[PDB]
Design a protein around this ligand. Structure first.
Ligand SMILES: OC[C@H]1O[C@@H](O[C@H]2[C@H](O)[C@H](O)[C@H](O)O[C@@H]2CO)[C@@H](O)[C@@H](O)[C@@H]1O
Ligand SMILES: [Mg+2]
Length: 537
């Protein structure tokens, strides 16, 4: 590969490339959604604004009707026109194939009418405004002419090698350590939008540890990093590395990192025991030791520190029911529960005098999180809870997470920047996790609460700020009381870039895109990074 025509990117590939199935983004190579398959809309989180992508236009034309207008001249990478047929199919395939993640949309979407050649009217039986916003940016459009005779088992389990999407890149090749994306010269976006991605190839690289990426970035072997990297001041000073902010904290906030708790494991089943753990943990020690202040500690509700979310901040609820770092309070609660260290080994036993210990886990190689769960474990040990950190490889970590096979688990997959605070509370409480074996959408510890479901629906169905503020407070109160998830800090939108080959990266001063290619972020304008960068030579 001609080096000056190629973009080396990493930070999102933590298992060997083997799946490009748009229906299973948890297993698909990052960029499957974004580079290959495309959404109806982008959402710009910096300005809280939707940007029509495959759609030309979309709007609510009544309380329960949403009219979508598709652009003309859209085409699949194989030459076949992309039309409203494909959008209808993308939704209707999940009617019979209930195993598809968004099959439940048909509980509140009633039908999709064909208005004209490229216009659809979505008619809703139950207008869930908040979740619809997320569906508009996250649902990839798939080609009817390819998927329409696939069995449900194929739809859900097929690797989908050499995926046929509509996007600006297709898959050229792949191996244990990489997926090579090649530019689609016929991408509809070039003619219709005037957007021309500059890299001829994007090599998505896999490493076994963040530490490996350091030397690659130092030597200009990596162009675009979405790895957490330590020692950023030295990277910038000595290797000309660029970041979003010129100075500290260097990094945008991306999501809420916190601990999901297995509520079916004694004594993690005890709500007050989970509250004790919350009081025990010192997020500032993580902020300084793991991140050298590139992140900030989370408010107790875990609400991202962003105007779109914080206008609903339940200050009175947090003042009343919130937790903070206070080991005295944690120990008070533990003593009241009867968890006492009778045998004087520093570890509390349960009420029957039986010793117990727990694990906390993160992916191996995620170096900042390894340090973070060491810190968390040590805090818990300081109040007599025997907790040991464990570092499964990413694949085992993910299976532990999705299947709810853990004691404590550090995660941030579902608490990311979005068009609605509903996605946060859904990421925490996702009711369907309880009776499903695997959950990919949140509530990974399978916390059950019938009251919470009704409140999520209330929030979902509202478009009035006063009502939204009201429901957010009720949801936050239950979060703070039962703590199925303990919010600790806002993890960074890790971005550093080398200018050895590519320049004009987006920055605070020139915020033309959010330069993040993790799955979920291409549609949060990560894709627009590719149109702005310039080949130095
Ligand atoms: O900071 C922890 C690691 O995050 C990784 O990116 C994650 C990201 O934080 C979130 O979990 C996401 O959407 O999945 C990503 C991986 O595909 C890497 O940046 C890694 O280097 C960090 O150690
Ligand atoms: Mg003891």
């Amino acid at each position: 590969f001609e080096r000056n025509k190629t973009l080396y990117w990493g930070g999102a590939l933590w298992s060997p490339p083997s799946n490009w199935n748009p229906f299973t983004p948890w297993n698909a190579v990052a960029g499957t959604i974004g580079l290959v398959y495309e959404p109806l809309f982008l959402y710009d989180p910096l300005n809280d604004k939707f940007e029509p992508w495959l759609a030309e236009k979309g709007e609510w034309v009544s309380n329960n009707e949403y009219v979508l207008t598709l652009r003309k001249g859209l085409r699949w990478q194989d030459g076949v026109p992309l039309t409203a047929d494909d959008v209808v199919f993308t939704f209707e395939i999940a009617k019979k194939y209930t195993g598809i993640s968004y099959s439940p949309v048909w509980n509140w979407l009633g039908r999709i009418e064909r208005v004209d050649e490229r216009t659809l009217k979505f008619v809703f039986s139950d207008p869930r405004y908040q979740e619809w916003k997320q569906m508009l940016i996250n649902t990839p459009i798939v080609p009817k002419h390819i998927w329409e005779n696939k069995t449900e088992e194929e739809v859900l389990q097929a690797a989908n090698e050499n995926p046929v999407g509509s996007g600006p890149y297709y898959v050229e090749s792949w191996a244990d350590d990489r997926c090579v994306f090649k530019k689609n010269g016929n991408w509809w976006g070039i003619r219709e939008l005037g957007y021309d991605p500059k890299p001829e190839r994007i090599v998505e690289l896999r490493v076994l540890s963040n530490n490996v990426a350091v030397g690659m970035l130092m030597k200009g072997e990596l162009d675009w990093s979405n790895f957490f990297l330590p020692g950023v001041p030295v990277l910038k000073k000595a290797y000309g590395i660029v970041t979003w902010y010129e100075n500290a904290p260097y990094m945008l906030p991306a999501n809420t990192a916190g601990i999901y708790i297995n509520v079916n494991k004694y004594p993690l089943s005890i709500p007050e025991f989970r509250r004790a753990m919350a009081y025990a943990i010192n997020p500032e020690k993580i902020v300084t030791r793991a991140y050298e202040n590139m992140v900030t500690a989370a408010n107790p509700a875990g609400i991202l520190p962003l105007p779109g979310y914080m206008k609903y901040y339940p200050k009175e609820v947090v003042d009343k029911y919130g937790f903070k770092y206070d080991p005295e309070m944690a120990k008070k609660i533990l003593d009241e529960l009867g968890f006492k260290d009778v045998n004087k080994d520093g570890f509390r036993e349960d009420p029957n005098g039986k010793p117990f210990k727990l694990t906390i886990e993160c992916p191996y190689g995620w170096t900042d999180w390894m340090v973070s769960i060491q810190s968390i474990a040590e805090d818990l040990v300081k109040v007599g809870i025997n907790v040991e950190p464990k570092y499964p490889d990413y694949s085992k970590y993910a299976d532990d997470l999705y299947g709810g096979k853990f004691d404590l688990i550090l995660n941030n997959f579902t608490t990311g920047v979005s068009a609605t605070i509903w996605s946060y509370f859904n990421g925490v409480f996702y009711p369907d996790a309880v009776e499903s074996e695997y959950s990919y959408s949140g509530n990974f510890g399978k916390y059950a609460n019938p009251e919470v479901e009704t409140l999520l629906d209330e929030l979902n169905r509202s478009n009035d700020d006063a009502k939204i503020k009201e429901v957010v407070a009720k949801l936050s109160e239950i979060l703070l009381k039962d703590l199925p998830f303990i919010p600790l800090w806002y993890n960074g939108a890790w971005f550093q870039a080398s200018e050895a080959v590519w320049t004009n990266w987006p920055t605070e001063k020139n915020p033309y895109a959010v330069p993040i290619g993790w799955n979920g972020w291409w549609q949060l304008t990560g894709i627009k990074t590719l149109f702005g960068i310039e080949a130095k030579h």
